[PDB]
Design a protein around this ligand. Structure first.
Ligand SMILES: O=C(O)[C@H]1O[C@@H](O[C@H]2[C@H](O)[C@H](O)[C@H](O[C@H]3[C@H](O)[C@H](O)[C@H](O)O[C@@H]3C(=O)O)O[C@@H]2C(=O)O)[C@@H](O)[C@@H](O)[C@@H]1O
Ligand SMILES: [Ca+2]
Length: 490
């Protein structure tokens, strides 16, 4: 028996958690095993290991006529709210109030987090992934390639074009082959963010393809004429091979591949893990220096960093109506928001990945000096996963090197980060329109975006058809309710 036990009799529950198109909940995870030891509740995964579409797996689960006890994963906020109000997920308000002291204390000190996760009916249907930190992504460029080609740090988009063209054509890796790929990215959606260079938005927040506000008006980036004009330039850069031809396909290991083989010249990605490649490749590629770069002055005369950490993220977990032990489940959920539970969900397992030194969790040298970024190492053992948990920036600080730290400091000091969209408060009937049309519109917008970038569709020629399709698919009905909710709030 332990003092942290939430049940005397051992309990096993079924969890469907497919996340980030790559992972599922693993009961064999060191973190999962330690939480199970401490709480006396074991979670067994029921999601499909083979699948590469997390959203599709949720949809199949909901249509399968049989629900597990817990459902977790990334980008499930809208689905948690929709199916919560339908009765598939249970409200947590009373359960938290009666059984979850840690969450109660958290929500009163973080009222904006409670607001962001609350449904239009007043119910909380899930607990969120709560990130910790301020900045997220920044631009990184190969300083050693700039120096080798005797080029200055590009200050404008036009200067950047010249630099990326030189990366492609002037053989900076010195192997006599045109193998260089100037701009690479882990995230296909970052190719859309390049429209920032031409004064167009791609998203209002860390959530992909999110709305934004300009002059008291709700706008969606993909519906704006600025995007039409901006994506033409992105398409041109793709055409000329300045953007990774595989930007839509390469994905997760883009940096390991392109930086590791000394072909990648630039990216836009998280400071800590991106700067880590300087250390990992220090001997394999002598002189490898990937440095933070201020965003280039765009066509609107400004230096935009569009991305920032989003607190909370639209990720987390919920309790189903089929769960026979909702009290034990909410108590397990609450363990994660206490000191020990928070430490495990961030750092891993004590004596394995970290040690308590002077009362502080300190990562082992084997973790810090490893080839893999620490967050990747955490995923492998069940930490830093998009369950209901509270991230602790102290975990991140420990593997944020001086190059990363100084880049973060530059971005904070110079205020590059654009004001982020914090959402609007929809009513139940407004949310019905939102849930009916928006997911399918977003999928269509992505498809059109990819087509424009790859040149299979001409953005100028197809814009009228695209706008007609947006209307036919209900996008403008969504826009009406979004503005209606904004005007009511502000
Ligand atoms: O320095 C870091 O790498 C930084 O990463 C943060 O994690 C990110 C991660 O880098 C990546 O961007 C990931 O992207 C997800 C996305 O959030 C969404 O779920 C999508 O459906 O799948 C993507 C994917 O992984 O393929 O998002 C992570 C996140 O937590 O937002 C943190 O680990 C941070 O502490 C770290 O320093
Ligand atoms: Ca070369």
């Amino acid at each position: 028996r332990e003092a942290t036990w939430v049940t005397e009799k051992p309990l096993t529950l079924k969890i469907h958690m497919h996340f980030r198109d790559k992972w599922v909940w693993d009961e064999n995870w060191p973190v999962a095993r330690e939480v199970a030891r401490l709480t006396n509740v074991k979670l067994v995964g029921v999601a499909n290991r083979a699948a590469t579409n997390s959203q599709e797996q949720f949809n199949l689960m909901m249509a399968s006529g049989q629900l597990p006890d817990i459902v977790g994963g990334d980008n499930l906020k809208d689905k948690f709210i929709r199916y919560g109000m339908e009765g598939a997920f249970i409200p947590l308000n009373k359960l938290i109030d009666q059984n979850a002291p840690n969450l109660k204390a958290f929500f009163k000190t973080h009222p904006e987090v409670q607001r962001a996760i609350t449904a239009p009916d007043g119910n909380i249907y899930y607990l969120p992934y709560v990130p910790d930190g301020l900045v997220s992504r920044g631009y990184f460029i190969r300083q050693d390639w700039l120096d080798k080609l005797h080029l200055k740090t590009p200050q404008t988009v036009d200067e950047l074009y010249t630099v990326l063209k030189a990366f492609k054509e002037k053989d900076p890796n010195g192997n006599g082959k045109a193998d260089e790929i100037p701009f690479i990215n882990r995230d296909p959606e970052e190719v859309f963010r390049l429209v920032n260079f031409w004064g167009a938005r791609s998203t209002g927040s860390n959530t992909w393809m999110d709305f934004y506000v300009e002059n008291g008006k709700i706008k969606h980036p993909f519906a704006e004429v600025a995007f039409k004009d901006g994506i033409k330039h992105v398409a041109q850069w793709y055409k000329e091979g300045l953007i990774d031809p595989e930007i839509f396909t390469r994905k997760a290991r883009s940096r390991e591949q392109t930086f590791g083989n000394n072909i990648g010249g630039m990216t836009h990605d998280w400071f800590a893990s991106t700067a880590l490649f300087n250390d990992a490749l220090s001997k394999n590629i002598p002189g490898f220096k990937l440095v933070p770069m201020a965003p280039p002055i765009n066509s609107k005369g400004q230096r935009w960093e569009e991305d920032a950490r989003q607190i909370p993220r639209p990720d987390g977990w919920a309790i189903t109506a089929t769960n026979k032990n909702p009290v034990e489940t909410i108590k397990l959920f609450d363990f994660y928001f206490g000191p020990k539970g928070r430490e495990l969900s961030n750092f891993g397992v004590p004596g394995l990945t970290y040690d308590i030194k002077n009362g502080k969790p300190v990562y082992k040298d084997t973790v810090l000096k490893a080839a893999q970024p620490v967050n990747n190492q955490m995923y492998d053992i069940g930490a830093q996963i998009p369950i209901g948990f509270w991230q602790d920036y102290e975990y991140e600080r420990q593997w944020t090197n001086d190059v990363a730290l100084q880049g973060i400091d530059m971005y904070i000091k110079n205020k590059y980060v654009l004001p982020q969209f914090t959402g609007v408060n929809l009513t139940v009937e407004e949310r019905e329109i939102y849930d009916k049309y928006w997911p399918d519109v977003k999928t269509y917008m992505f498809e059109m975006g990819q087509s424009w970038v790859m040149g299979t569709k001409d953005p100028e020629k197809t814009w009228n058809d695209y706008q007609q399709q947006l209307k036919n698919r209900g996008f403008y009905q969504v826009m009406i309710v979004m503005q209606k909710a904004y005007d009511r709030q502000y």
